[PDB]
């Protein structure tokens, strides 16, 4: 759950963490690890592509079976629900009957011992990936794909995931966490159940070291920025810039969504906030 | 106040299945009357209430049509 840390030092007074009692193994599988490195917020070209992030704690990579489609009709027990920091959620390894173990996203309330099926015959216990032909309308879903068989991309937020609304014709309607409705094929791949670590939103950061570890760099406010560096720069004292806030990269607040996407016709309306 | 029929041991048992006993106690609008009108009994009309409202939920009698 959530465990709050006692104030031993003035720095870690407010630090509270979601204790990971949901851990079973501590040393990740060495076979599936691929060579990875912190890119430092920089491309191969050497320029800093995005500031406020980079540096920190070098970490490893592991392949997740996001698009599980190659093998079907075989069951798998939950091997060990381990901790992968490269995601907000957790990964629970599976012993499939063919002996080919792949990592998958651990759904909410998953504990070691449940049997998971991936295919048409799969039931409604969480972790079962199956096309929309075999799912009731109205069930909460996660790790949702966009086409019948091109790899799953969406619905992997910890705690709130996409909810299926209804099927009409050959197009299916999906409700977004933002409260929006997206039209998607009735043959895409989607799983059942919410994603775990819902209590992760109750994490309290704590200090700056954790944050350089996590990746982000300290944020430099524009009002003290130099005027050449930023439109908010300059001033003798504290000033807001004398104009509406603007990213120093030229454009102010506003529309950024370029229309006319191939899935733009597959969207009914855009998000509305604070209702 | 007239007689309460179901306090008879010769009277039929009360349940959600018998639509005749269900709709003999419901108004044409679709409503259940009062003890003062019907003359019937209290735990008795509690049994009718549960039976008929159960039937209404299973869509055997209208919802105030």
């Amino acid at each position: 759950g959530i465990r709050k840390y006692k104030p031993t030092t003035p720095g870690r007074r407010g630090a509270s963490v979601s204790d990971f009692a949901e851990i079973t193994r501590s040393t990740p599988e060495k076979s599936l690890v691929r060579p990875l490195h912190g890119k430092g917020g920089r491309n191969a070209h050497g320029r800093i592509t995005t500031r406020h992030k980079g540096g920190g704690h070098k970490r490893a990579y592991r392949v997740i079976d996001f698009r599980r489609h190659d093998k079907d009709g075989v069951n798998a027990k939950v091997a060990h629900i381990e901790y992968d920091p490269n995601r907000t959620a957790n990964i629970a390894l599976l012993h499939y009957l063919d002996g080919e173990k792949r990592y998958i996203i651990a759904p909410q309330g998953l504990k070691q011992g449940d049997v998971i099926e991936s295919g048409a015959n799969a039931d409604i216990k969480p972790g079962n990936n199956l096309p929309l032909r075999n799912i009731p309308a109205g069930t909460v879903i996660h790790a949702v794909e966009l086409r019948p068989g091109g790899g799953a991309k969406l619905a992997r937020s910890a705690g709130v995931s996409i909810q299926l609304l209804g099927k009409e014709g050959t197009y299916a309607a999906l409700r977004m966490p933002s409260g929006e409705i997206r039209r998607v094929d009735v043959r895409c791949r989607a799983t059942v159940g919410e994603v775990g670590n819902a209590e992760q939103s109750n994490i309290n950061w704590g200090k700056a070291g954790r944050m350089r570890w996590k990746g982000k760099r300290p944020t430099v406010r524009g009002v003290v920025m130099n005027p050449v560096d930023h439109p908010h720069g300059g001033g003798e004292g504290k000033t807001s810039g004398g104009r509406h806030p603007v990213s120093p990269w030229g454009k102010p607040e506003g529309r950024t969504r370029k229309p006319n996407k191939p899935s733009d016709k597959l969207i009914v309306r855009r998000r509305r906030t604070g209702k | 106040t007239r007689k309460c029929v179901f306090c008879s041991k010769k009277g039929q048992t009360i349940d959600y299945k018998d639509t005749a006993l269900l709709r003999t106690y419901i108004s044409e609008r679709g409503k259940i009357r009062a003890r003062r009108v019907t003359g019937n009994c209290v735990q008795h009309q509690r049994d009718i209430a549960v039976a008929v409202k159960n039937a209404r939920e299973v869509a055997l009698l209208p919802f105030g049509s």
Binding site: - | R56, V58, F63, S65
Partner: protein, 96 residues
């Protein structure tokens, strides 16, 4: 091991003959688990009080069940998942 009453309403798009095989296949799970006793009677094609699931009519089937709460809950979970069924419930035949 308590007497239960269940009623199932099916979509009218299915013919009357298929109901019996469908219901017996549905309740085979209880038949094979607890060694239970059942009774089945059928009557359908009644005019519904209102539109339900944009439908105007249906078929009624009532089964008396002497089984386990786990078994009846399993039947409920397996059956309400079906799309051809509309509305179902389970009650207690005894005092409670």
């Amino acid at each position: 091991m308590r007497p239960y009453e269940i009623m199932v309403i099916l979509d009218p798009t299915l013919d009357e003959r298929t109901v019996a095989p469908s219901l017996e296949t549905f309740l085979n799970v209880i038949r094979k688990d607890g060694g239970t006793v059942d009774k089945v009677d059928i009557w359908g094609r009644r005019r519904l009080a209102y539109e339900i699931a944009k439908h105007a009519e249906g078929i009624y089937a009532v089964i008396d069940v002497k089984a386990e709460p786990a078994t009846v809950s399993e039947l409920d979970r397996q059956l309400n998942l079906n799309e051809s069924v509309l509305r179902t419930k389970v009650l207690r035949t005894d005092k409670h």
